[PDB]
Amino acid sequence: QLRFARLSEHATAPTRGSARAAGYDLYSAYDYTIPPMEKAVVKTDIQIALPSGCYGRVAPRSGLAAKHFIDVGAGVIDEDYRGNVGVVLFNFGKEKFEVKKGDRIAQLICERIFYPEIEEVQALDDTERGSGGFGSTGKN
Amino acid sequence: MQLRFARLSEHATAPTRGSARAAGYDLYSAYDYTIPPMEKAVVKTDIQIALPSGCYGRVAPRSGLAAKHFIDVGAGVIDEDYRGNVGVVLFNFGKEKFEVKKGDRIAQLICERIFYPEIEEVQALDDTERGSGGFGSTGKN
Amino acid sequence: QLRFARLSEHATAPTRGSARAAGYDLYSAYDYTIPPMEKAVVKTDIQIALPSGCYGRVAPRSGLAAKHFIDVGAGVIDEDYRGNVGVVLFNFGKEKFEVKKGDRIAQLICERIFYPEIEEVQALDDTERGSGGFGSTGKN
Ligand SMILES: O=c1ccn([C@H]2C[C@H](O)[C@@H](COP(=O)(O)NP(=O)(O)OP(=O)(O)O)O2)c(=O)[nH]1
Numbered sequence: 001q002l003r004f005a006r007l008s009e010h011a012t013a014p015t016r017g018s019a020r021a022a023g024y025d026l027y028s029a030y031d032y033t034i035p036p037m038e039k040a041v042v043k044t045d046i047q048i049a050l051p052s053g054c055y056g057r058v059a060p061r062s063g064l065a066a067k068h069f070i071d072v073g074a075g076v077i078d079e080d081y082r083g084n085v086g087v088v089l090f091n092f093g094k095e096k097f098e099v100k101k102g103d104r105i106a107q108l109i110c111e112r113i114f115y116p117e118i119e120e121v122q123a124l125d126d127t128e129r130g131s132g133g134f135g136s137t138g139k140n
Numbered sequence: 141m142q143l144r145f146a147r148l149s150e151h152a153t154a155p156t157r158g159s160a161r162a163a164g165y166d167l168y169s170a171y172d173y174t175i176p177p178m179e180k181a182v183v184k185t186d187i188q189i190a191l192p193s194g195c196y197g198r199v200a201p202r203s204g205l206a207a208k209h210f211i212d213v214g215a216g217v218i219d220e221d222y223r224g225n226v227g228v229v230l231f232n233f234g235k236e237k238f239e240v241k242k243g244d245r246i247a248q249l250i251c252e253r254i255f256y257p258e259i260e261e262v263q264a265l266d267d268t269e270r271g272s273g274g275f276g277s278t279g280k281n
Numbered sequence: 282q283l284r285f286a287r288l289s290e291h292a293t294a295p296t297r298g299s300a301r302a303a304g305y306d307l308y309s310a311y312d313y314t315i316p317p318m319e320k321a322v323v324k325t326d327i328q329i330a331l332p333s334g335c336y337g338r339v340a341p342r343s344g345l346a347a348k349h350f351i352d353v354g355a356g357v358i359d360e361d362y363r364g365n366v367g368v369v370l371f372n373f374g375k376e377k378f379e380v381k382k383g384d385r386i387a388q389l390i391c392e393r394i395f396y397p398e399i400e401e402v403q404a405l406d407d408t409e410r411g412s413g414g415f416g417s418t419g420k421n
């Protein structure tokens with residue numbers, strides 16, 4: 001029930017790395033050289049139709065993160081998006097990062113969400129947390 | 141099921157959906173900010189929100205700002221029970237300063253459905269095929 | 282319904298900071314000194330078994346983010362993972378960041394997800410958004 005179409009011969013069908021993996025691994029359709037502390041938008045050359053009740057989160061893989069300081073920016077693929085799915089890769093490492101066509105460089109998660117109507121009110125109910133934020137619960 | 145919000149000042153803007161089925165409500169800065177290269181700022185929305193039960197509000201980055209200006213969103217977990225001013229923690233990872241003006245959509249808010257499970261310690265867990273596989277265990281390509 | 286086991290004497294059972302906090306706070310099992318612009322994989326020394334229908338997202342705490350420019354990389358703990366839960370911490374601040382054993386340095390969110398079957402199709406339906414992305418809706 002996750003539907004995709006290839007936009008070029010360079011796309012690879014996403015794959016799940018394990019039986020209960022949260023993500024479908026996304027493959028680069030092209031080579032990219034990302035200098036240290038730089039970014040690139042990596043084309044997958046796929047369009048997707050997400051199942052009703054979710055959006056597609058482009059999320060980072062752990063190996064690339066831990067090994068090479070690679071992160072994923074942006075990442076919110078909308079249910080109504082019909083364009084090329086682009087992975088916004090951040091290279092926070094000291095080294096340049098090579099992406100080759102067919103490298104799995106991010107993963108796609110079908111994050112379940114509500115599409116709530118927004119409503120303005122004058123006052124919200126109170127809660128126990130209240131305005132507590134930004135470390136209000138402490139360090140340890 | 142509604143997302144309720146209240147303006148904490150006249151400088152707040154009602155969040156808006158960018159497209160009919162956009163996962164997020166765009167969040168507007170209530171203030172001007174000049175964010176230096178490789179620095180962060182907590183952008184005040186001057187709204188408080190009441191999330192529908194069984195979700196939290198994820199402050200997520202917009203893709204244009206990410207792809208074009210190396211802007212990212214830190215933190216981002218707005219709890220169901222938060223009634224404070226919603227802050228967007230913006231990271232400017234670019235080499236140039238980033239300008240936020242009051243009224244700019246600088247992030248989006250997603251109603252992420254979650255569980256609130258009770259936590260239970262056990263002697264050991266069931267085994268799986270993945271097992272202790274992680275950090276690239278499945279390969280590069 | 283979120284089961285965990287301690288992998289060592291140095292782990293701490295995850296705790297919620299408020300009644301309806303999205304995250305279970307994760308505690309470091311070790312001391313780390315993370316220099317500026319560096320990363321570390323902080324070991325929790327716990328294994329977890331997430332409830333069916335979610336994955337465990339390691340998310341950053343706002344206190345650490347706003348005060349110290351601490352961010353969380355990777356973060357996708359899969360339902361089938363039985364290894365040591367690692368927190369990929371990125372220190373983007375000017376100062377080194379000290380993690381002490383027992384510090385709450387991230388949180389784990391039980392994000393509800395679909396595990397869809399993937400299906401390749403010829404083409405997808407048209408939407409109003411279409412291929413609009415990357416700021417197509419404007420700045421303000
Ligand atoms: O990582 C991403 C993020 C977004 N996108 C595409 C799909 C998404 O539906 C579209 C818009 O995403 P966002 O709303 O998160 N970004 P922004 O608000 O800047 O774009 P827009 O003005 O079009 O809504 O951009 C990608 O291809 N990769």
Ligand SMILES: O=c1ccn([C@H]2C[C@H](O)[C@@H](COP(=O)(O)NP(=O)(O)OP(=O)(O)O)O2)c(=O)[nH]1
Pocket residue numbers: 132133134135136137138199214215216217218219220221222225226227228229298299302304341342343344345
């Ligand atoms: O991006 C954010 C993240 C959090 N917050 C606020 C709302 C949230 O409910 C509250 C607590 O967030 P976190 O639990 O993610 N951070 P931390 O654990 O540091 O704060 P606390 O100790 O108060 O729980 O801080 C923001 O305003 N913007």
Ligand SMILES: O=c1ccn([C@H]2C[C@H](O)[C@@H](COP(=O)(O)NP(=O)(O)OP(=O)(O)O)O2)c(=O)[nH]1
Pocket residue numbers: 017018060061062063064273274275276277278279339354355356357358359360361362365366367368369
């Ligand atoms: O922050 C993280 C991310 C992942 N992990 C572990 C748990 C997760 O189930 C496993 C694999 O996560 P990802 O699939 O997100 N990363 P990657 O694809 O690089 O690893 P693998 O090849 O094993 O699937 O690594 C952590 O402990 N901490």
Ligand SMILES: [Mg+2]
Pocket residue numbers: 017021061278
């Ligand atoms: Mg994986």
Ligand SMILES: [Mg+2]
Pocket residue numbers: 158162202248418
């Ligand atoms: Mg948008």
Ligand SMILES: [Mg+2]
Pocket residue numbers: 071072212213352353
């Ligand atoms: Mg980041």
Ligand SMILES: [Mg+2]
Pocket residue numbers: 137298302342388
């Ligand atoms: Mg907290």
